[PDB]
Design a binder for this molecule. Structure first.
Ligand SMILES: Nc1ncnc2c1ncn2[C@@H]1O[C@H](CSCCNC(=O)Nc2ccccc2)[C@@H](O)[C@H]1O
Ligand SMILES: Nc1ncnc2c1ncn2[C@@H]1O[C@H](CSCCNC(=O)Nc2ccccc2)[C@@H](O)[C@H]1O
Lengths: 311, 311
């Protein structure tokens, strides 16, 4: 849970994601008017680097909150950089902790999971917004989108599914039923994309509620190559827009530099032929799992069949 | 625990490890005299492929035992290959389950973890041997070794340790103390090896006891390149020897084809210069962690400093 985030390993991976970390750095350093003399809340501050960016940009006060043990490392790091007079770190869940202020001017966080919403803390960020954001205050990143794109990769498909038909001369076909419903997080070869992307979800963190994060979308994939469609890929775009002189965007899609989010891939049980110029129609719904509500399920209808996928 | 092994993902990885899986296949198919008309116990049978190898080689009966939910998939797989009359699958811990026989002729398993002994079930295999192996019976694989080799990789070292000194202009040096004591599982470039390997441990599964698996060894690394020594790497070799006409060996060392075990790397807090022809002397001790006894610690003394490492 918060246990995983107690270990340095995930923090190292996020910090070495240059697209991710340089986007936040650029947003703050190139829009210091958003931070100068402001009270900033960093929801899930981790190692504290985002809090230190906000302090450097002239924040009056930064409150860094994390439930994980990493906050004790943040505490030493803030002291090592001599920022303890500007940055106050608080251990606990943003849902329960006591803040030395009633309201904040700005909320910043990196809450995004695989396919944007997996094991994401947007729900925790929205709690902080509704309870703590001042009237006329701002939350960043402010705008997110989710997109789908069609994939043709018969070899990758055969590696994951057809593999189980003959394993050292033995049939293991009954394994396919456990494999198909698990989404795969992997970097896609952009040469395997056979459609234009379709946006299925737009979120503004200023106006969205937790109930908006379970959604359905009809979609149309404009096919660009006559091929066997073997999978649908998902990815997301992150925007820093509100009150920016220097807007910042990053994509986690396969046409962009890879990030630690990679892409999320939903393998089709039955690949099917498509033709260039075809308008491929489908439906996708995202639900919070009843068991672990940090677990998503994604229901995909395409080519007259429906499959539910989890991460 | 057994929970991780309930999921197909780890079984797919082990089965697609050709060095691992073709070694077991070759051992059984090229030494069928070991199996013909024998009663075979497969300790931790997983998906059941090893049990099916033993049946194909003419086993009278194969008992496949696994604590994990994967055993239910094994049950369908054995039925799909029409081997249910030869292979009996039993769900539970080999330590507690009831077997329809008092003794077995042969025990087979794949128990090996990172650095041979991490989260390894050799203890469970030895329980099965001491309780169930007939007089004059055989256990496979029968012989294992662990080796160390010296590494020079200043860039990899700087990527993992020196990285934390300056992260986007902020000091994060206090992170180094969490990083140094974690062993890294990774495939090494064989060009970075700067010593001959040194064997630190020989196990014969016929004669070894659980108490032998906590051990100390003095070692000498024959340096082959004047360089900065940045790490010590560990790996292991697996032998099928007893009563074989066709002996089988595989190595998980960096001079051999990569396996899912890769190599285990112990980064040095203070890299130090070595000269070609130098006899580098050290000491290594392996202990079962007091907290999780599936967790090892490795204490390494080299160049007049000592560090304890965990996985
Ligand atoms: N309800 C919750 N209340 C309190 N903490 C919670 C809650 N839910 C989750 N968490 C924590 O949120 C973190 C998400 S991972 C981001 C670490 N922070 C960064 O890298 N930031 C950064 C660095 C550079 C650039 C941009 C950002 C974990 O540490 C969780 O322990
Ligand atoms: N005390 C215990 N009692 C019962 N089961 C236990 C115990 N400790 C651990 N386990 C299980 O042992 C497995 C180790 S992973 C190997 C799967 N088997 C293979 O791939 N075999 C194979 C395939 C091809 C070639 C060679 C071998 C897991 O499924 C655990 O659930």
């Amino acid at each position: 849970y918060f246990s995983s985030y107690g270990h340095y390993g995930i923090h190292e991976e996020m910090l070495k994601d240059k697209i991710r970390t340089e986007s936040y750095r650029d947003f703050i350093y190139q829009n210091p008017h958003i931070f100068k003399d402001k009270v900033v809340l960093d929801v899930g501050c981790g190692t504290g680097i985002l809090s230190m960016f906000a302090a450097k940009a002239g924040a009056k006060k930064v409150l860094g909150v994390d439930q994980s043990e990493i906050l004790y490392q943040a505490m030493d790091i803030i002291r090592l950089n001599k920022l303890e007079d500007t940055i106050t770190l608080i251990k606990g869940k943003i849902e329960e902790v006591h803040l030395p202020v009633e309201k904040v001017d700005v909320i910043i966080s990196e809450w995004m999971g695989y396919f944007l919403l997996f094991e994401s803390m947007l729900d925790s960020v929205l709690y902080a917004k509704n309870k703590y954001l001042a009237k006329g205050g701002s939350v960043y990143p402010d705008i997110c989108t989710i997109s789908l794109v069609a994939v043709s990769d018969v070899n990758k498909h055969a590696d994951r599914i057809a593999f189980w038909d003959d394993v050292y001369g033995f049939k293991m076909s009954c394994m396919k039923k456990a494999v198909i419903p698990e989404a795969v997080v992997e970097v896609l070869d952009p040469k395997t994309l056979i459609s234009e992307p379709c946006g299925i979800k737009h979120i503004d963190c200023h106006t969205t509620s937790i109930s908006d994060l379970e959604f359905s979308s009809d979609f149309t994939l404009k096919i660009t190559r006559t091929s066997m469609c073997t999978a649908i890929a998902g990815y997301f775009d992150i925007y820093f827009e509100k009150n920016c002189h220097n807007r910042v965007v990053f994509s986690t899609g396969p046409q962009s530099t890879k990030t630690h989010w990679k892409q999320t891939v939903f393998l089709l049980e039955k690949p099917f032929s498509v033709k260039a110029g075809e308008a491929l129609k489908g439906k996708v719904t995202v639900h919070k799992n009843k068991k672990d509500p940090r677990s998503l399920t994604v229901t995909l209808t395409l080519n007259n069949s429906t499959q539910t996928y989890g991460l």
